[PDB]
A paper describes a structure:
The same crystallization condition also produced crystals with a second morphology, which were of the space group P2221. The diffraction from these crystals displayed severe anisotropy and had resolution limits between 2.0 and 2.7 Å. In this crystal, [name] is a dimer in the asymmetric unit, with the tetramer again being formed by crystallographic symmetry. The tetramer could be overlaid onto the I4132 tetramer with a root-mean-square deviation (rmsd) of 1.5 Å. The main difference between [name] in the three crystal forms arises from slight changes in the orientation of helix three, which results in minor variations in the size of the central channel.
Numbering used by the authors:
A (entry chain B), C (entry chain B): 11 to 89
B (entry chain A), D (entry chain A): 11 to 87
């Protein structure tokens, strides 16, 4: 079971994690606000999110996969 | 081709978003460090994560939902 | 690149996968219908889905995890 | 405690759902077997899955969206 010490520790784990989860939500909300402003100024949010997605990935692997993709699409007449 | 105005604003958007994402990554890292510390003290990280998930809903509705679960589980043997 | 043979193969992969994905959607829709009927007859859908969830998991691991869970919850006064 | 009526219907619901789930599992297995076969013939399963995902949307809007992407990617260098 959990003793006085372990009980105290457990409480701290939950409280610490919960505080951080709140901060994570604040950041997530701020990111949503940025996209909201961008949409208001005429930018395509979906495309913006893909730009951020692409920039996260390794360039070498991204360019290689995009190459194989174009091959398959044109093979079945899609690009 | 986007003009200088749209170009300059596009860069600021991506730069800003990417900044928040790193800030979010830091927070996610801190959450891992707590669970990693807990695991070191003999805690079950998987169970801990569920407790946090459980605590998102109030205790009343929690036990009410679980009462129906046991009612169903006992009914089907 | 893709030759005549590989091009023919690729087309078959996409068509075969796409047909199966359609069937997967039919099943998923049928599952939704069952829950719709259950809800109509007074059953809590959320609880039902958890019953199916529990029954999928290994009983030994499930019972062990549920045991550790009750320990932690009562330690911080939640159960 | 649920009565005989609610009990009997509860069992049928879970039994039915669980049956559909296995049927769904079979279909998911068949999809894996195709990709496993494709990989054997030298295809890239990850790319194949994207093609199926791409084909869900029509070619017109596809290339329209990608045109904006390149416009944005070139603007930010």
């Amino acid at each position: 079971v959990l003793n006085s010490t372990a009980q105290g520790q457990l409480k701290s784990i939950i409280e610490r994690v919960e505080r951080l989860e709140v901060e994570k939500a604040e950041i997530m909300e701020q990111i949503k606000e940025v996209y909201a402003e961008a949409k208001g100024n005429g930018f395509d949010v979906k495309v913006l999110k893909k730009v951020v997605r692409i920039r996260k990935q390794d360039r070498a692997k991204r360019q290689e996969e995009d190459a194989i993709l174009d091959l398959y699409l044109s093979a079945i007449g899609e690009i």
